[PDB]
Amino acid sequence: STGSATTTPIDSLDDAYITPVQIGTPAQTLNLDFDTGSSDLWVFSSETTASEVDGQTIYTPSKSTTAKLLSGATWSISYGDGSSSSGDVYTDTVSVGGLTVTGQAVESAKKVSSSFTEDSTIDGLLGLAFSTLNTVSPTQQKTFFDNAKASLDSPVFTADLGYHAPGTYNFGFIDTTAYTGSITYTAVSTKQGFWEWTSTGYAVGSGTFKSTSIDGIADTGTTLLYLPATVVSAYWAQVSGAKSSSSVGGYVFPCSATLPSFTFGVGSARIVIPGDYIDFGPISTGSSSCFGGIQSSAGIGINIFGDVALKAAFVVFNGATTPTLGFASK
Numbered sequence: 223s224t225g226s227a228t229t230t231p232i233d234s235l236d237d238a239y240i241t242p243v244q245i246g247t248p249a250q251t252l253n254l255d256f257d258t259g260s261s262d263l264w265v266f267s268s269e270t271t272a273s274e275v276d277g278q279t280i281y282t283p284s285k286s287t288t289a290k291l292l293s294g295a296t297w298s299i300s301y302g303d304g305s306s307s308s309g310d311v312y313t314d315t316v317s318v319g320g321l322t323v324t325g326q327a328v329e330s331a332k333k334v335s336s337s338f339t340e341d342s343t344i345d346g347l348l349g350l351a352f353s354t355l356n357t358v359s360p361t362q363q364k365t366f367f368d369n370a371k372a373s374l375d376s377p378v379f380t381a382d383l384g385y386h387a388p389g390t391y392n393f394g395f396i397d398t399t400a401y402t403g404s405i406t407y408t409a410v411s412t413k414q415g416f417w418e419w420t421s422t423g424y425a426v427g428s429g430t431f432k433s434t435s436i437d438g439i440a441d442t443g444t445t446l447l448y449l450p451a452t453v454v455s456a457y458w459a460q461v462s463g464a465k466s467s468s469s470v471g472g473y474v475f476p477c478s479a480t481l482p483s484f485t486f487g488v489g490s491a492r493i494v495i496p497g498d499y500i501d502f503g504p505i506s507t508g509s510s511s512c513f514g515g516i517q518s519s520a521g522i523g524i525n526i527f528g529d530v531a532l533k534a535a536f537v538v539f540n541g542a543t544t545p546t547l548g549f550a551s552k
């Protein structure tokens with residue numbers, strides 16, 4: 223089997239991407255944030271505290287003939303941005319882009335934190351990291367991908383995120399028309415539950431490539447590119463007037479600037495992030511200070527190749543027995 227679904231930016235800055243997912247019978251379609259940095263499929267639901275729902279589409283398990291309470295199971299998750307959610311669990315039929323999994327754990331939110339409530343465009347998350355990170359207790363549950371894997375033509379999914387445009391998540395096949403050149407594969411460590419890999423270095427603009435190992439995660443659920451302070455300082459030093467602002471919470475730059483590109487290494491290959499991908503616009507409406515798309519990972523504890531980096535590539539998440547990650551230009 224295979225699946226193919228379009229993923230669409232939630233706003234003009236590509237702050238996140240939503241992908242339609244069919245849950246239950248008859249289908250209830252919710253727009254979920256596919257997140258290769260976590261491993262829970264959770265949704266706004268008929269059980270979510272009413273004051274914490276503001277415009278989201280909800281899953282109502284009582285209206286699904288295939289929903290079954292997973293008795294005794296609860297979940298609770300906290301993300302790196304400080305947001306959180308928790309609730310109980312149903313199993314139901316879940317389909318993505320024509321690919322169907324029966325008996326998928328659908329985590330129904332009873333509570334969500336304010337940033338979820340305030341974002342009316344995201345109806346929940348669909349985790350695509352390794353199932354060892356799944357938060358369901360007392361019986362840990364499998365991700366949609368892990369449940370689908372045996373049925374897939376090939377045990378892979380691909381992320382092809384657009385810059386200010388829709389893109390595609392494919393399951394079970396590699397679309398050889400969706401990238402240019404060849405795909406460079408690189409080793410993955412699953413020790414922390416993430417798609418964790420080591421970049422071979424970086425360049426700033428037309429500068430020389432610095433060969434240096436940068437361990438980090440491929441995380442579709444993180445907007446920005448978070449790298450060591452040394453690397454990020456070298457980037458922003460090439461932008462007149464750029465500075466790190468503790469009041470704003472990271473690097474800002476004059477909105478009048480033209481940003482240089484940023485290149486990262488994948489083995490001997492190179493992925494180039496155009497400067498425009500690094501512009502996240504005014505810090506507040508009408509401001510002439512703009513927020514940078516490359517930020518320091520110091521204090522996070524891990525480097526994160528988020529959407530800013532991933533959208534510059536066609537990315538293969540190879541879930542074979544020995545997992546690997548592939549990157550191609552596009």
Ligand SMILES: NCCCCCCC(=O)O
Pocket residue numbers: 238255257258259260301302303305337338341344441442443444
């Ligand atoms: N790996 C990313 C974890 C955080 C995702 C948060 C998405 C949201 O606010 O809808």
